[PDB]
Structures are given as C-alpha cells and as structure tokens.
Symmetry: C4
Subunit: 390 residues, 4 copies
C-alpha cells in the first residue's frame, strides 16, 4: 500500500513568482466553439503525483442560457467539480463529484477525500466521499447555513483535518474541526479562545504537530482569526492576528485599530477568504499571506511574508513581497496549497479572479497561481484577458 | 488475477442523502457548444474501483436534427453507451458498447459484462459481450419482444445473474434468469410461483445465497412481483409483494386492494421500473424502495424503507423516508446499485428524470443519485434545471 | 515482456449477429456542436486488450469548409487515424499516426505496427512505424501507384505479413508480401500462380502455417484472387476462387462464367475490397465472406459461409447466411478482423457505408460490425440513420 | 526507478521522408465546431515511451474574439502548452504547463522538465518545473529580454543542458548554458569563442561527450553560430559555420561571403531558428540541416546533409537532400528532435508553417515532421491545406 502523506520541509526558495493562469472564459465567446463551466470558489489540492483544480459550478456553461442565478450562492444545482491542474475546466473535461454549494478536498497519500455541503439553509449537511464511495455526513449545529473551507483539507498519517462552521453571517458562527480518517469522522473538535466568528479558514501545516489557519470573521473585525490546532492532542485555540497589516476586506488604514491585539475595532461588516501558506525551514518558519490592494473593494492582490514570531501577539506590519494582481484587475478569494516535489514541498498561493458584470449576465472566475521559486523579488502580475461582452 | 467479487455487509448508515445529479441537457442549448447524447433508461453499475453510468441512446445529440423518433422505444439505431460516473455523457465522452434497445451490465471483479438486446420484435436477441469480445447470445422464447432489466446484473464468485423476459406487454410475459460466467450462459433458470407477468426487475443481493428483485407487472396488478433466487440451488420463486404501499405506477389508494397478499386487484394497465436496494447488517436486512409521488403520473419520487420481515407476506405499509423528487419534477424509472467502499458496500438509488415535451421535440433524461449516508432524515430533493425551449 | 501473439481456435458459435454501428455523421448537422472527421477505407485491428478503429481521413470535419476534394483518393493531406473501437472518430478523439493515402495496421502482442503509403503516384512509398518510431520504408517497383491492404496486417510470433501492390488499375498489378518484425522489413515475398492483378487483399490466419487472403482484381475478372501464404517457408501462391458465387462488384449472374476455375470471364472492369474471415475449429475450417446485394452497385451486403474444401477448386455456390445491409443502404468496402477473447478468437466482418452525395458535397463513411456469436440465423440489418442534407 | 536516458546510435537509414502533419486550423472554420489554439514556436521532445508536441499559445482559439495581439511576441497571456504527438492541440486536449513567452522542455528518462521564461523585458525570468513542481528560476543578466531555445533541451544521465541568452536583438546577446538536474540549476556555463550574438540554438548530442547546436545570430551575419559543449568538462566554445551554404534567413547568395571562416560578411539583420539533428553511426556522424528556399523570405524549406568534417572549418557546400516545403508554402522555424526506438534513436526535423495574414487577423501555425527512414531520396513535400478566410 502507498505510505501516508506527512508535511515535509519546503523546497529551497526565497520568493514567489508567477506560475500559471487558468482563464477558461478566454474560450467562451459567442463566436467560439468551447464550453467553459460557470464557477466560483476555486481551490487546488495536490496528491503525491498530481494536483487537482476544484470549484463549485452552477451546472451551466458560457455561451449558454442559464446565466440567471449564477450570482446566487446556494441552490440545488451547484456541484463540486475538478480537472487535473493545467486543463481548462470545460463541460467535458470536468468530473462532477457531488452536489454541494460549499466544498473542500484533500488527498491522504492513498486516496481523495471530497467534502461537500448542501441541504436547506436551516439544516444543511456536510457530506463526505472517499474515492468513489459516499462514507459519512455531519449535521448543522447552529441551524444557520452550515458550511466549510473553500480550500484544501489537511492530512497527516491518514488523518485529515477540516474546518466547518455554522451561524449567522452577521453574528456568532462558532467553528469546529472534524478529524476524518478514510472518509469517516473519528473526532469532533471544539476550539477555545476568541470564538464568536470564524469561517472560511485557509489551513496548513506549520509542522507535524501544528496546523495553522488564517480565517474570516464576517461581522466583528477586519483582523483575521488565526487558529492553532495541535494534532497531537486534538485541541484548538483561536486568537486574532495582531499585525498592523489587516488582512481582511473591507478594512481600515493599517494600524488604525487602537488597543491590544484582542481589540476588534469597528465592525467593518463583511470579509473575504484569504491566502495563507507555510514555508518550513529546519530553524525558521515563513508565513506567506495575500490581501486585496483596495481596502474596500475586491481588486488587486498583494503578497506579504513574515518569518517566525507569533501571529497572536506580534503587532509588527507584514513585509510586502509583491503585487500579484494590479488594482485594475479583480482580486477575490485566495488560498494556499503545496505541491509535492521529490523530496520537499512547494508552497503556492492561488487567486480567484471573478468576472463580475452584474446580476444580468454570467458570473464566473479565472484562477491565477503563484509559487515559491528561486530567489530575488516577485517579477510579474496576472491579468485575465477576458472581455465580458464577447 | 484479481479476486472475484462477493456482496459484503453494507456500510454504516441509517439514511439516504442527495449525492449527485447528471443533467447533460443543461448544456444542450441551441446557443451552447456542447453535444449531450439523447438517452433513456439509464442505470449505474460499479466495479471495485469505478462506477459506470450506462444508458440506451438514440444515436443523436442536442442540439441536433434527429429528434423525430427519439420517443420511439425500439429501432436499429439504439445503442448501449456509458461514461465513468461523474462525466457528462456527451458524443465524445461516451463509449458505444453495442447495438441494443434494452440493456444491462455488471462487473465480476475482473471484467465487465455488457448485455444488449436487439433484433426484430418477433425474434429479438440477447447478446453478451465480455470486455471487448462478443461471447454469447440468447433467443426469444415467446416471440414477443424479448427484453431485459434496464439495471445492473448481479455477480458472485464469477457467476452473474440476469433477468430476461418475453411476452405481451398486456398479457403473459414469463421471465427466466440466466446464469452467466465469463460471457457465456452456463445455466437457464425457470422460476416458480406467480409467473404470469414479470419484467424490468431490479435485483440485488440480500445475502451470499439469495438474490432478490422488485419487478414490474405491466398488465395484471399495481403490486410488484418479487423474486427470491437461491444462488446455491439455482432455483427461483416469485410471489407478489404484500405491502399496503403499492409500488407500481399507476396504482390505487394505499391498502385499497382487498383480499389476501396474492390478490391482484384491478388491472391498472401499465407500470414503471422501480428502485430497490439492500442494506445488509449482521443481524438485520433493510429493504429500500422508491415510487412516484403521483399514483397516476410519472412525477415525484419518494423513498421508503422496511427492515426484515417477508415481502411476500407482510401487509404492513412501508415507512416513508423522504421525498427525493417533488411532484413538479419528473419521476420516471428508478434503480438500485451499490458502491464498493474499502471494506463495505454502499447502497444507492438512481432516478431517471425524463424531459418529455411531446412527440415533436427531443426526449431525454437526467439521472439523480441518492445513497445511504450518515444518520438523520433525508434533507434535500433534486431538480433538473432544464428549460426544454432553449 | 508480453508474449507474442499467435492465432488460436475461434470461439464457439455458428452464426454472425449485428454487434455495433459507428455512425459519426449522426452528429455532423450544421445545427450540432460536433466535429466528426471525413474518412473512407476504415478497418479494425485488435491487440490482446483493445481494438482500434483505423481510417484514412481527408483532414477535414463536418460541418466544415474543406469538402472540395474529399472524393479525391490521393493527395498531400490524407492521414491514417484511429480511435479505440467504440469511440466516435472526432477531431479531438482521433490520434493522427502518419501521412498516408493507403494504410494498414496490426499488433504483434507487444506493440502496434502502422503502415501508410504516400508520395507521388509514379514513385509512392510504403512507410512503417512501430509504436512511436518511424522504422522502415519500401519503394515502388512498378512505378504506378504503390499501395496496400486497407485492412489489418497479420502477425505470428512477432512476424507480421503485409500485402502491397503496384501497377495499373486497368492492367497488371503484381503483388508482393512483406515479412516485417519490430518495424523493419526482414523479407520480401514474390508470389506464384495467377499473378496479373491482385490488390486490396483481406488476409487472415487459416492456421499457424497458412495465411489466406481474398483480394480484388480490378481489371480481368469478377472472380476474386485467393492467396495461400505458407508462413513456414515464406512462399505464396495465388489462384482464382472457383465458386459460382462471384464475390467482386461489378459481377455477372452467379455461375454465368463458363469454363474451368481459372477462366476469367468478361473483364467487368472495377472491383471492391471484400470481407473475409476465418472460423477455426479443431477439425473444420469455416470461411466467411461478404458481397454487395447489387451485382452492379455498391448497395447492400450479404454474408456467406463455406466449410472446408479448397477455394481454388470448389465450384459450388457459397451458402447465404444473411443480409447485413439492405439494398437501400450503401455497401462499400468490407473487411474481416478477430477479437481476442480470454481463450479463443472471435471472427468479425466490418462494413464501410459511404455517404455519397456527389462531388459537390462531403464524402464520408459509417462502419458497421458483425461478429460470430451464438447459434441460429442472422437476425438484423444495419442502417446509418444519416440525412446528408443536415 | 527507470534508468536515466543517454543518446544511442541512430537507427539505420540514409534518407528523411514525410512523416506527419499537425494542421489544427483545418478545423477552425467559422462553420466548424472545433477549438484549435492559437500558437507559434512549436517544438517536439520525446521521452522513452511518448513524444509531446509543445508550443507557446496566445491563450486564444479560432474561431474566437482575441485575435488582436496574436502577432505580438511577449505579453502576460502566453503559456507553454502541449499535447501528445498526434493529437490536435485544441483548447481541451492541451495541458497548460506555465506562463511563458519563450520555452523549452525535455525528459531525462524519469520525468519532464519544463522551461518557460516570462517577466518584464528588462528583467525577465527563466522558470523551471520538474513534473508537477516548480523547482528553480534564473535571472536576466543583460537586462534585455532574457530568453531561451524554442526547442528541446538535452539530457544525459539525469543532467539536462539548456541554452539561454540575453541581450539586444540588434547587438550583443551573449549566451550561457545551464546544467540542470531534477529541476534545479547545478551549474552555469559561460562559452568561449565568437560570442557576440547567439540565440535560439537547436542542440543535440553528437556523442556522449559532446552536445552541438546550430544557432541564430540576429545582427551580425547570415552564417549560423555553432556550439560545441563538452559534457565531460562543462566547457563550451562557439565559432561560426564555415559552409558556403549559409543557413540563416535573410542571407546572400551561397559562397558570396568572402574571407576566412570567421568573416561575418554583411549584417543581413534578422534571422530564423534553424533545424539541426544528428545521425550517429559507429564510425561516421551525419549532420542534417534545414533552411528556407527563399534567401529573403520565410517560404519553403530545404533539407541538407553533411557527413563528418568540422563545421567550424569546412567551407564546402552542404549536400541538398530535398524540398520538404515548396516556396508557395510558409517555411518558418525548424527544429530537430529524436524519437526513441527499441534499441536506436530516430532523428527528425520539425517545421513551423505559420499562417500569416497580417496584424488584423489571427496568426498561428501548422507543424510538419520529417524523419530519417529507409533509403533512397526524399519523395514528398508538405502543404497546410488552410484557407485563412474560412
Ligand atoms: C456558504 C456560502 O453561502 N458562502 C458564501 C459566503 C458567505 O456569505 C459568507 O461566508 C458569510 O457566511 O459569501 C461569499 P461572498 O459573497 O462574500 O463572495 C460567497 C460564498 O458562496
Ligand atoms: C423493451 C421495451 O420496449 N421497453 C419499453 C417498455 C415496455 O413497453 C414495457 O416493459 C412493456 O413490455 O416501456 C417503457 P415505458 O414507455 O413504460 O417508459 C419503455 C421501454 O423502452
Ligand atoms: C490507393 C488508391 O488509390 N486506392 C483507391 C482504389 C484504387 O483505384 C483501386 O484499387 C485500383 O488500383 O479505388 C478505390 P474505389 O474508388 O474503387 O472506391 C478507392 C481507393 O482509395
Ligand atoms: C523572446 C522573443 O521575443 N522571441 C521572438 C524573436 C526575437 O525577436 C529574436 O530572437 C531577436 O531577439 O523573434 C521571433 P521572429 O519575429 O523573428 O519570428 C519571434 C520570437 O517570439
Ligand atoms: C513529519 O514526520 C515524518 C516521519 O514520521 C518525517 O519524515 C517528516 O519529515 C516530518 N515533517 C517535518 C516538517 O519535520
Ligand atoms: C460472502 O462470502 C465471502 C467469502 O466467500 C465473504 O468474504 C463475504 O463477507 C460474504 N458476504 C456476506 C454478506 O456475508
Ligand atoms: C499456434 O501455436 C501456438 C504455440 O506455438 C498455440 O498455442 C496455438 O493454439 C496455435 N494455433 C492453432 C490454431 O492451433
Ligand atoms: C552512451 O553511454 C551509454 C553507457 O553509459 C551507452 O549505453 C550508449 O550507447 C552511449 N552512446 C553512444 C552514442 O555511444
Ligand atoms: Ca471582516
Ligand atoms: Ca471535446
Ligand atoms: Ca402494473
Ligand atoms: Ca473485378
Ligand atoms: Ca542573421
């Protein structure tokens, strides 16, 4: 049998560089002959010998006739789909995994675990598939839109950790973590700390004993909730990030939130899922983050890094590393993932570039990928090249 | 060599939940650039490492110009086709197995067995393919439209059991079972009991010694014929189901048929293939069924369960478990199948949702899948999302 | 390494039955969204674990704009292409093997051998590819359109035999056979007997020591040239078939050619490649043939069988076995091939059904397949279902 | 683990012959239903069991709406893509490897190495991918459009050699060679000799100790720079080819450049990447080259051969071997590659046939392949068959 997967030391590098752009709508012209799927919330998850590009589709293509409702978030048509990283997600190239309006996926070194949530809002359901089999489900506990990550889950030794949350977008949404093995929930983990609102966590391995996540708090602050989950004891604690470099959107000027680390500041109602990925060295730990260039709008995307320290307590500003997407371009959700190289892991940040043209036309997205490679400074940005009027 | 397949104990679960929807016609708009095939009578059959989604196509696509005749059942163009479960059955994604206007398929743990019937009505022919080779055939015995299951066949130890029938849709159609091994018929089985009319059986393993099937009687009753085939002796007996919860369509009010179990009641001419799948426990046996919400029309689909007892004699009503498809939606054929998980089998029910718009336009279908997963109550229904006018 | 392939005994059966229809032009409507390739001269060749459907394309699709010249036979655009048997040969599904306006292919149990002829008419060239590598070539010897089989080549123990010919369509075209091993010509074989005109041979194994072929004589007779190639000595002899059942098209009434077996009769200028496949039994040898229903036109196709005897000397009429294609349908080239089953070989006959609508529109073909299966009589015919005006 | 790859002796042959034509735009008609990608700079690279056809796409298809800018060379949309040799490079068939406006790729016998350059002109970046992982990068040293080969890199024992260059198209562009192993740069090689301008080298193994390349000098001569890289010492020297048969375009009459081998002659500003491939014999060494038929324009393509001698010093004219593409047809870039046969290597020359119709329409290319096969003389030329107005 294939051995289980474990996080390794990251590959040598000191900078991220532009790697790949998946812009399916460059082939959606009325005049063309292609069938790109209408998606949102894309992410990437890799196994030992291949990366898959997942997304939640509206079960419709461009060109097409089912544009009405593609801006709506939850419905009975949404499905979690995927293609091998590098292929254009078309009607024919995609595989439909399950019905879901919220998802996640990960590989334990032996098989794929697909997570998808659906069901009525007041009683949603987390469904789990292992390979080709439907294995387990989890019920809503706050009866207000149970939902999950929108990024990869994290496995170690055959145990995969996943964040789920339930609650009001504008109130309390206390999250929990699920310990899954071979498609079945073996443990339920209730976190400690600042818990009032945690959603859309982007998690990763900081080491073999700790999983860290940068999340979204949709109602109380522009500071991102940060999770430390001890895999050894299966205990999690959450505290807000202390950096002057607020990573949520919308947000106020940097360092404008006065008070100790724990101070929420103004509500700044709303948020965005943020990119976060680890760079593990024998001695150091690099934490890479991404945020929109606009404090108010989903445009642009900047890279930031920060070595060592403690996110829960360091107030210091993060170090700008580069502009991945300019303000003229869409900068929506971002996520982190790692590519498995021969003897080391490669950290990457993916970016969702949504083509928004209103409620009267289609609504979909491109996915730009940036990975740690070589040294130097980040050289080039990403554009989608799509004219929504074609 | 790979070992043969045997039924195992079902996976832990106490409820079915919405799993997947294959709606190819969401990409058939005149405006689109896709080629979904025109099909009917879909089913699913799984091997140890993959499920295939089979159907009988009219060898035509939407958009297209061969809509005339797609409502006709038998012709010289129909073919048995398949895609891996999860892929949209398009012109290019499908594999054409053989010419057939009635089919079945199953995997013995080593190879695929494709069954397809064609030939003139008065002298049809059951043809058998094993992998890439045409291996055997079976002739018509009643000379009135020989036909088969329209669902998976069942294998154990390399022996696959298949139901075939021959006879008048409005009269006697006595069925037989064929014992096949490696593509060749090794035995012919003539059942005992109530035999006047049995067709379109949905069979499954109740254990390693018994195969049970819920069938359709098209001319004498709204009660479904139920088969018990002893794999050990190769003997089969048939008796009608005694439940007050009549599973055929059309049908009369529940429990309206007076008399002992054997009473047919009024003719209620016509029928529908029904879903039926087993849930095997160490001590118990769960029997899951599906039927249309309308007593008269092919709309809606309800799930029902019943633990233990004897179908041939228990008059008790089945226990409603959920609405998989509302009355506003099409509820046509349904079938059962099982997904092979690492150490247990997963029972599922598939539903054919036909887009019927008359004899002047195309006629095709979506396939909704529900599988046993987790506990609780069934949460959400399925809709096709197709506007036949696009 | 995989062992080499050898002919085995055929599988049990006493009749051919309709198996499969590949009609790509059912998806070529102006209104559709497909891309079937424009082809002619299709054939099938099988390895141990898969059959491939080959053809010579005009490097154009329907719908499209390169219909002018698709009725022309040789040009610089033609290519030998293939798909796995069962897939529709589309622009994307096909693999382009090499430039050729005449082809052949076969598998030795380890790898594929692709044969393709191209080059100017007065100095054509047989090119040989083994797997992904171009291995050998053969020059024109009569400088008048060197060409090959248009059906599978035959391998035994790693040695593959192929018929090539050169000469005037209306005069002498003496054929030769090439002994190839691992992509390179190891021997050249010059046949004895009646050699004035042999082309488009359909060859097969009658046993482990003899390869027999039914060929076409385009200028001197309506009787088909018949080859007996002794694999042991690498010697070939050719004599005309003596049957009253003339297998070429055009042809005169049956048994109308007076004189001994060797008499050519009237010229009946022209011909057609004919189907021919062996049924090997421990004691007997069945020879199956196919010919058009019309003596003058390429419409319809009949099956015939003949057990034992000697084709070179038996004048007896062949035994009609069935109508595979009615006179209302196109009956062009036919070929034979064998499917490898677990422990026996399955003989099949393929039929080219060309959609001819003149020099002003596209010109392409469907492929119908009939294989030996079960017993009884041949039940059903094949139709293409294509309306050339769509 | 699979053993590393090493150059072997070439397969027996004495001539090149027409092998294959990949003309994706034969399926790009407004009327068609296909999606060929818009590309330029195609090349081929083979592993032990498969060849891949690479190219730099403009991330647009025909028919489509993104033709403006497809004649521009560098931008943020270009990507290195590939298909298995033989498949039409369509939107769905292609795999997108990375963002790059200049590329190269090669296989070491265990894995694929993808090279792609992008970034701003004054600070471009060579990025390296090994399999699915981004492994290394290389910075610009002359800050004037760092770029690479546009043909396969060359591996031996797990070490792959690649040419990169930097500098003014109209001035000095001193090249360097990178020694890469498993995706990471292990050595940097600075060549000796005539170094003022070397770009777009077409390299190959002349033996296990020497890699030779025919390159382009865009500003000082119509004579091609020729590299001899000793793999044993990792030292490279460059000198101009001495042949009277000038291989660049534009160029003056043959032998019109007076003076010793080293004389540049007139500037003849501009160039073209040229085909070059080795034919290794136990005693001899054949060097095959290709050049446009027109001295001034990119039309036509001729083959030339030359056995033994020393390119740096032999003034003798090369021996014309054939016309692969006539003057009526486009003859743009050409490259060499080798197919791995069972026990020998097969040398081939690929040709880029660009469909140029101005800056107001699409700009893309066909790829014709010629390989060493059999003996005799080169028989047939290649045409694209594309009408740019459809
Ligand atoms: C399960 C779900 O509905 N997720 C949706 C979330 C959700 O509103 C917030 O997490 C608050 O709970 O909103 C985002 P957006 O509009 O901010 O892009 C789109 C998601 O599809
Ligand atoms: C072989 C065949 O013809 N099967 C057809 C059956 C058949 O009429 C009944 O089983 C009675 O024999 O009807 C159904 P339906 O119209 O009820 O959906 C469609 C099937 O294609
Ligand atoms: C190599 C070649 O040209 N083959 C062609 C042959 C050829 O004329 C005859 O064999 C006489 O040599 O004709 C047939 P058809 O028109 O009879 O269908 C079409 C083939 O493409
Ligand atoms: C990296 C790059 O820009 N390469 C381009 C080169 C380049 O100008 C010359 O090598 C001079 O440096 O030109 C060619 P062309 O127009 O001659 O076909 C097209 C290439 O895309
Ligand atoms: C995690 O543990 C495994 C051994 O159990 C080891 O091979 C791997 O390198 C460890 N990861 C880190 C970051 O040390
Ligand atoms: C059927 O028999 C096999 C052993 O022959 C066993 O492994 C399997 O679990 C049995 N099935 C059931 C339901 O007991
Ligand atoms: C041909 O020879 C091989 C052994 O060399 C044998 O297995 C095969 O059955 C033979 N074929 C026939 C028709 O006897
Ligand atoms: C290169 O070296 C390997 C052994 O290291 C050998 O097998 C191969 O044939 C050599 N190549 C040539 C051209 O001699
Ligand atoms: Ca917020
Ligand atoms: Ca396709
Ligand atoms: Ca009934
Ligand atoms: Ca003739
Ligand atoms: Ca020059």
């Amino acid at each position: 049998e294939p051995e289980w997967t474990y996080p390794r030391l990251s590959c040598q590098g000191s900078t991220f560089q532009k790697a790949l752009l998946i812009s399916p709508h460059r082939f959606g012209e009325i005049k063309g002959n292609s069938a790109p799927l209408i998606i949102r919330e894309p992410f990437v998850a890799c196994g030992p010998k291949e990366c898959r590009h997942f997304a939640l589709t509206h079960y419709a293509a461009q060109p097409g006739g089912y544009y009405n409702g593609t801006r709506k978030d939850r419905n009975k048509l949404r499905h979690l789909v995927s293609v091998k990283l590098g292929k254009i997600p078309t009607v024919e190239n995609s595989i439909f995994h399950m019905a879901a309006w919220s998802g996640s996926a990960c590989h334990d070194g032996r098989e794929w675990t697909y997570i998808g949530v659906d069901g009525p809002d007041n009683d949603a359901l987390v469904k789990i598939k292992y390979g080709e089999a439907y294995t387990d489900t989890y019920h809503s506990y706050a009866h207000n839109i149970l939902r999950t990550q929108e990024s990869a889950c994290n496995c170690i030794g055959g145990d995969c950790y996943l964040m789920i949350t339930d609650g009001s977008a504008s109130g309390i949404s206390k999250c929990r973590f699920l310990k899954i093995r071979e498609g079945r929930i073996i443990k339920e983990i209730l976190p400690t700390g600042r818990v009032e609102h945690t959603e859309e966590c982007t998690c990763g391995f900081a080491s073999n004993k700790t999983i860290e996540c940068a999340c979204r708090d949709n109602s109380y602050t522009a500071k991102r909730p940060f999770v430390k989950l001890n895999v050894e004891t299966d205990t999690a604690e959450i505290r807000l990030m202390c950096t002057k470099t607020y990573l949520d959107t919308p947000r106020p000027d940097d360092g404008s939130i006065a008070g100790p680390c724990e101070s929420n500041g103004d509500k700044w109602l709303g948020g965005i899922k943020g990119g976060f990925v680890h760079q593990r060295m024998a001695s150091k730990i690099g934490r890479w983050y991404s945020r929109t260039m606009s404090k108010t709008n989903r445009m642009g995307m900047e890279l930031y890094v920060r070595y060592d320290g403690d996110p829960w307590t360091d107030s210091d500003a993060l170090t700008l590393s580069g502009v991945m997407v300019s303000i003229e371009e869409p900068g929506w959700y971002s996520f982190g993932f790692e590519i498995k190289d021969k003897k080391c892991d490669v950290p990457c940040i993916g970016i969702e570039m949504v083509h928004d043209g209103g409620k009267d036309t289609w609504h979909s997205a491109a996915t730009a990928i940036y990975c740690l490679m070589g040294s130097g400074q980040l050289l080039w940005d990403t554009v989608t090249g799509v004219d929504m009027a074609l």
